C-alpha cells in the first residue's frame with residue numbers, strides 16, 4: 001500500500017515487485033494477503049439480543065423498579081388465600097412496564113441503521129484481476145484483491161480497491177467520483193504521476209478510488225491500498241473513532257437517576273431512625289412477620305412513587321409528534337432525541353451552492369474590449385436578462401436592447417462558449433421547462449449562446465424541444481471539435497482544439513479556444529481582440545480588465561467570472577501530447593484575450609430572512625463555499641452574514657490561510673470567522689472540533705461520503721435530500737429541499753418543542769415528589785397505606801400521562817427566536833422553582849395522607865378513631881380491650897385509599913393548569929389557552945371514575961366509589977393548590993428577580 005499518486009507507474013511495479021504482464025504470482029498473493037489483510041471493511045460489531053436486552057435493564061431507575069418488582073412479587077406470594085386473589089397484579093404490572101420498556105428499546109435498535117454499514121454499499125462483490133496462475137483475466141471476489149496485483153476495470157464497474165492507473169486501454173477514461181469528492185460530472189484520468197505528495201483526492205488524476213464508478217472506458221492498474229487503508233477506509237475509521245455525546249436531556253435523565261437513588265436511600269434511613277423507639281418494645285414476635293411485610297410493601301410503593309414511569313412514554317410521543325410536524329416543513333428528523341440538541345444550536349455551518357443559493361447559474365454581464373489606442377482604452381460592457389436556463393432574454397448596452405450580431409467581438413466570445421463547453425440543454429415536455437444537461441456553470445454559457453444568437457439565425461418558428469440547442473449546434477457545425485484539454489486546478493482553465501471543416505475557411509484553419517479563471521488565463525495573454533483585429537496586450541489595457549473583473553466579483557453583484565480567450569496560432573497538432581494535465585498549461589499560452597463573462601448564483605428567497613432570524617436567535621452562521629474569499633465575502637454581505645460596510649479581517653479565511661496558522665490562532669479564528677472559502681475535506685472536521693472547544697452546539701451540512709466524518713462529529717449533521725445515502729445515514733436530519741432556510745425552521749421547532757416538553761417534565765416530576773412525601777409520612781407516622789403501588793402507576797402512566805402530553809402542545813412564545821441559544825447545562829429545576837415543588841410536593845403529600853386519615857376519624861361513613869392512635873392499628877386484634885372497641889379490619893377499607901387517590905388525582909389536574917406557564921398566573925394565562933389540556937383533564941377524570949365504578953376494576957385497585965359529600969371533601973383539599981401556586985408565582989413575578 002502506498003502514496004502511489006505521486007509515484008510513477010514503474011516505481012509502483014517496483015515497490016510491489018510485480019510484473020505488469022503476469023500480475024502477482026500465486027505465492028505473492030498468499031504473502032501479500034497475510035500482510036495486508038482482506039480488501040474489505042471491518043466486520044460489524046457483534047451485539048446479541050441478550051446484550052441488547054440487558055442494556056435495557058442497565059438504567060439505574062429501571063433496576064430500582066425491577067428490584068421492587070420482586071419485593072412485590074414475593075410480598076404478593078404471601079397474601080391470605082381468598083382474602084385476596086388480585087395479589088399478583090401489583091408485581092405483574094411493574095414487569096409489563098419493564099417488559100414494555102425493553103421491547104421498545106430493542107425494536108428501537110433492530111430498526112436502527114449504521115452509517116458505517118452504508119459504506120459497504122460501495123463495495124463491489126466481484127473484481128477482475130490478472131495473476132500469474134492464468135493467461136486470461138479472472139473475475140474474483142473483491143475481498144480477495146490484494147495491494148499489488150494487477151486489475152482491469154471498465155464501464156459499469158464499481159471500483160474495488162484504491163488503484164494507481166498503469167495504462168488506459170481506451171481512447172479516454174471517465175470516472176464518477178461524485179460521492180467521494182463532490183464533482184457531479186465524470187472526470188478524466190491520466191497515467192502520469194502527480195508531483196505533490198500531500199495532494200487532495202480531487203487532484204490525484206492518476207487515481208481510482210474504491211466505490212466510485214467508471215463512467216466511460218476501460219483501463220488497467222496496480223492496487224495502491226485495499227481495505228481500511230483506501231480513501232474510503234480512512235473515512236470508515238474517522239467515523240468509527242468518532243464518539244457521540246448524549247442529548248443533554250438524556251444526560252439529565254442519568255443525573256436524575258443517580259440522585260433519586262440517593263434520596264430514596266436516605267429516606268429509608270430516616271424512616272428507620274423515626275421508628276427507632278421500636279428498639280424499646282417488649283421482646284416477643286408480636287407480628288414480627290407482620291411488621292416486615294409492612295415495610296417491604298412500603299419499599300415497593302416508595303419505588304413506584306419516586307420513578308416517573310410514564311415520562312419516557314410522554315417524551316417519545318411528544319418528539320414523534322413534532323417530528324411529523326417538521327416533515328411537513330421539509331425537515332426530516334432521523335433521531336427523535338435530537339429535536340432537542342437541535343434547539344440549542346449555537347453555530348450553523350452551511351455549504352453554499354445547493355443550499356444557500358439556487359445553484360441555478362445564469363450569465364448577466366459580458367465585456368469585450370472596444371478600443372486600445374496607447375494608454376486610452378474603452379471596454380464594451382453588457383447585461384443579459386433571465387435567470388433560468390431558458391433560451392429567453394435579451395442583451396443590452398446601457399439597458400438598451402441589442403442584436404448581438406452587430407459586434408464582431410461578441411460573435412467570437414459567443415462561439416468559445418458553445419465550443420469549449422461540454423454541457424448542453426434539453427427541454428423535457430412533461431414538465432415544460434428547460435433543464436441543465438451538463439454542469440451548472442457551463443450549461444449557463446449554453447443558454448447565453450441561445451439568448452444572443454450572433455447570426456440572427458431565425459428560430460422563432462420552432463418548438464421548445466429543438467429550440468434548446470439551436471444556436472449552439474449552429475456554431476457546432478462551423479468548426480470541428482478535434483480534441484479537448486480538460487480542466488485542471490493547476491492552470492484553472494480548459495480549452496479545445498478546432499478545425500474549420502468545409503473549405504473556403506481553410507485559412508486561419510486551426511484555432512484553440514480557452515476559458516478559465518481570469519487572473520489565471522489573462523497572465524497568459526499577449527494579445528487582445530478588438531473586433532476582428534488584434535493588438536499587443538499592454539499594461540493599461542490589463543489593469544482596466546482586471547479592474548472590472550473585481551467590481552463584478554466584489555461588488556454588490558457577487559458575480560463569478562470566466563475569462564474567454566483564444567490561441568490564434570496553436571502549436572501543430574502532432575506537437576501536442578494530449579494526456580498530461582501538466583503540459584496543457586504550456587499549450588494554453590500566447591493567447592489573445594477576447595472577453596469575460598460574469599454569471600450569477602442567486603441566493604434563495606427565504607434565505608435572506610432566515611439569516612436575519614439567526615441574528616435575533618443568537619445563532620452564528622458560518623458559510624462554507626468554493627468561491628474565492630474576495631467574492632465569498634461579497635456573497636456573505638449580500639445575504640447578511642456580513643454588513644455592507646462591516647470589517648472582515650479576522651472573520652473570513654481560506655483553506656490555505658487557515659492551514660498556515662498555528663493551532664492556537666487556528667482555534668482563535670473559529671470563534672469569530674463566518675466565511676470559509678475554498679475549503680479542503682479535513683477542514684470541516686477541524687472547524688467542528690474547535691467550535692466544540694468553545695462548548696458550542698454546531699450544525700454541519702454535507703452531501704457526499706467525504707462529509708460523513710464531519711457530519712458524524714458535528715452535534716447535528718445536516719444531510720442533503722439530494723445527497724448520498726451514506727451522508728444521510730450519518731446525519732441527524734435531512735433537508736428535502738436542500739434549502740438552508742429549512743435548517744433555521746427546524747431549529748425553531750426545536751426551541752418550541754423543548755419549551756413545552758420542558759413543562760410537562762417539571763409537571764410529572766413534582767407529582768412524583770408529592771407522591772413520595774405521602775409515602776414518607778405514611779411510614780414516618782405508621783399510618784395505614786394511604787396510596788398503593790397499583791394505584792400510583794395508574795396515576796403516573798395515565799391519569800397524569802394525558803395532561804402531560806397535552807402540555808406538549810402549549811402555544812409557543814412569540815419571541816422564541818429573539819432569545820439566544822439555550823445552555824445545555826441548564827438544570828430543569830433549581831432555585832426558586834426547586835422550592836415551589838419542594839412546597840407543592842410537601843402539600844400534596846399532606847393532602848393525600850390526611851385525606852385518608854380524615855375518613856378514619858372525623859367522617860360520618862368511617863369510625864371516628866379521632867385523636868387516638870389510628871397509628872398503632874397493627875397491634876389491634878390483641879390490644880382491642882385497650883383502645884379498640886371496634887373491628888380491626890377498618891384499616892383494610894377502600895374508602896380511605898379511594899380518598900387520597902381522588903385528592904391526588906384532582907390535585908394533579910390542578911397542578912397541570914399551574915404548569916401552563918412557569919411564572920404567569922392563570923388569571924393572566926387562562927387554562928382555556930391550551931384546549932388539549934382541558935380536554936385530557938376530562939378524559940382523565942372519567943378514567944378515574946371508570947376504575948371507581950366498572951365492577952372488575954374497583955376490586956384490583958382496592959377502591960370503592962365515594963358519595964357526593966366525600967367528593968366535596970376531595971375538592972376542599974385539592975383546589976387550595978391552585979392558590980398556593982398563584983401565590984408562589986406572584987412571589988417570583990414580583991420580588992425575587994423576575
Ligand SMILES: C/C=C(/C)C(=O)O[C@H]1C(C)=C2[C@H]([C@@H]1OC(=O)CCCCCCC)[C@@](C)(OC(C)=O)C[C@H](OC(=O)CCC)[C@@]1(OC(=O)CCC)[C@H]2OC(=O)[C@@]1(C)O
Pocket residue numbers: 252253255256257259260263264267305306307765766768769772773776827828829830833834835837838
Ligand atoms: C422524585 C422526587 C424525589 C422525592 C427526589 O428525591 O428528587 C430529588 C432530586 C433527585 C431532584 C429534585 C428532588 O429534590 C427533592 O425532592 C428533595 C427531597 C424532599 C424531601 C421529601 C421527604 C421524603 C427535583 C426533582 O426536585 C424538585 C423540587 O422537584 C429537581 C431536580 O430535578 C430536575 O431537574 C428533573 C431533571 C430531569 C434535581 O435537582 C436537585 O435539586 C439537584 C441535586 C444535586 C433533582 O436532583 C437532580 O438530579 C436534579 C437537577 O434533577
Ligand SMILES: [K+]
Pocket residue numbers: 244711712713714715716717730732
Ligand atoms: K452526530
